[PDB]
Design a protein around this ligand. Structure first.
Ligand code: QUE
Length: 274
C-alpha cells in the first residue's frame, strides 16, 4: 500500500516535539488548510531488505492498517499518512496532556486509579472486540487529553507492535518492554489478547503503589521475574489498598494465559463493575 507522496511541509507546519524513540520522532503540527492541530509521527524506513535500522515496510503497513480501523474515544485516531524516500509520516490525533507515565511521576487513590483504568479497559475492550492485540501497553503509551482536570481523559497510543489476531494467537517476532510483557512474550510462545491483560495488571499495580511489580536491576532479571511470576504486594505500599483491588491484580498476573481474566472479565470484576 502506498501513501501520499506530496511534501508534508506543503500541507502542514510543525512545531513542538512531543517525543522521540528508536526510529521515530513525533512533532506537533498544524494543517494549513483548516488550522486544525495534529501530531505527526515520522517513522524511519529501512534502506535495504536486511537492514536492522529503520522500520520494515511490512511493519509500517500493519500499524497503519490497524490505525485505520480504529474509532473510539479512548484510542488515538489516524488522520492521514504521507511518505517520502526516508520516512512514513503518520498524521495522528493531537493529545496535549502528556504521558500517564509523567502524570504518575508527579504523585493515586483507588478512585483516581480506577478512573484511569476504566478508560483503559474501555479502549482495550474496543480493540479486543476487533481482535486487535496492542502488545505494548504501559504508562508511557497512555496519553492524557488535559492533565489539569481532576479526572483526566486518556487515549491509548503507539500501535507499533499491534497485531490482528484472527486465529486466536500469533507467533512472530513480538517483544515489548520487559517490565510490562507477559510471560508468554518472555518465553517466545504464541501470543494472543491475553498478553494485553497481563500488561493491564502491571499498569494497575503501578497506578496503586508507585512501584513496578517485576522490575529487577537488569533487563534479564526483570524478564526472569516475569516468567516466574515473581511479584508480591508490599505492605508498605498496599497497606491501605483494598483487598478487592489486590484481587483484580492477582487475577491478571497469572502465568497461564487461559486462566487470566479476559477484558470482559475485567469489566465484570467487582472492583470495576458498578
Ligand atoms: O508520542 C506520541 C505517539 O507515539 C503517538 C503514536 C500514536 C499511534 C501510533 O500507532 C504510534 O506509532 C505513535 O501518537 C501521539 C499523538 C499525540 O497527540 C502526541 C504524542 O506524543 C503521540
Amino acid at each position: 500500500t502506498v501513501f501520499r507522496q506530496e511534501n508534508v511541509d506543503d500541507y502542514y507546519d510543525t512545531g513542538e516535539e512531543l517525543g522521540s524513540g528508536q526510529f521515530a520522532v513525533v512533532k506537533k503540527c498544524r494543517e494549513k488548510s483548516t488550522g486544525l492541530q495534529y501530531a505527526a509521527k515520522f517513522i524511519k524506513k529501512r534502506r535495504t531488505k536486511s537492514s536492522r535500522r529503520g522500520v520494515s515496510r511490512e511493519d509500517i503497513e500493519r500499524e497503519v492498517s490497524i490505525l485505520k480501523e480504529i474509532q473510539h474515544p479512548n484510542v488515538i485516531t489516524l488522520h492521514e499518512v504521507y511518505e517520502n524516500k526516508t520516512d512514513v509520516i503518520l498524521i495522528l490525533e493531537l493529545v496535549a496532556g502528556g504521558e500517564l507515565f509523567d502524570f504518575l511521576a508527579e504523585k493515586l487513590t483507588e478512585e483516581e486509579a480506577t478512573e484511569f483504568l476504566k478508560q483503559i479497559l474501555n479502549g482495550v475492550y474496543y480493540l479486543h472486540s476487533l481482535q486487535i492485540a496492542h502488545f505494548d501497553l504501559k504508562p508511557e503509551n497512555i496519553m492524557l487529553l488535559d492533565r489539569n482536570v481532576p479526572k483526566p481523559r486518556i487515549k491509548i497510543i503507539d500501535f507499533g507492535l499491534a497485531h490482528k489476531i484472527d486465529f486466536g494467537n500469533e507467533f512472530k517476532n513480538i517483544f515489548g518492554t520487559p517490565e510490562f510483557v507477559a510471560p508468554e512474550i518472555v518465553n517466545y510462545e504464541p501470543l494472543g489478547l491475553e498478553a494485553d491483560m497481563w500488561s493491564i495488571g502491571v499498569i494497575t499495580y503501578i497506578l496503586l503503589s508507585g512501584a513496578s511489580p517485576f522490575l529487577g536491576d537488569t533487563k534479564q532479571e526483570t524478564l526472569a521475574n516475569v516468567s516466574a511470576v515473581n511479584y508480591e504486594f508490599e505492605d508498605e505500599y498496599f497497606s491501605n489498598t483494598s483487598a478487592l483491588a489486590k484481587d483484580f491484580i492477582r487475577r491478571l498476573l497469572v502465568k497461564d494465559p487461559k486462566k487470566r481474566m479476559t477484558i470482559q472479565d475485567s469489566l465484570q470484576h467487582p472492583w470495576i463493575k458498578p
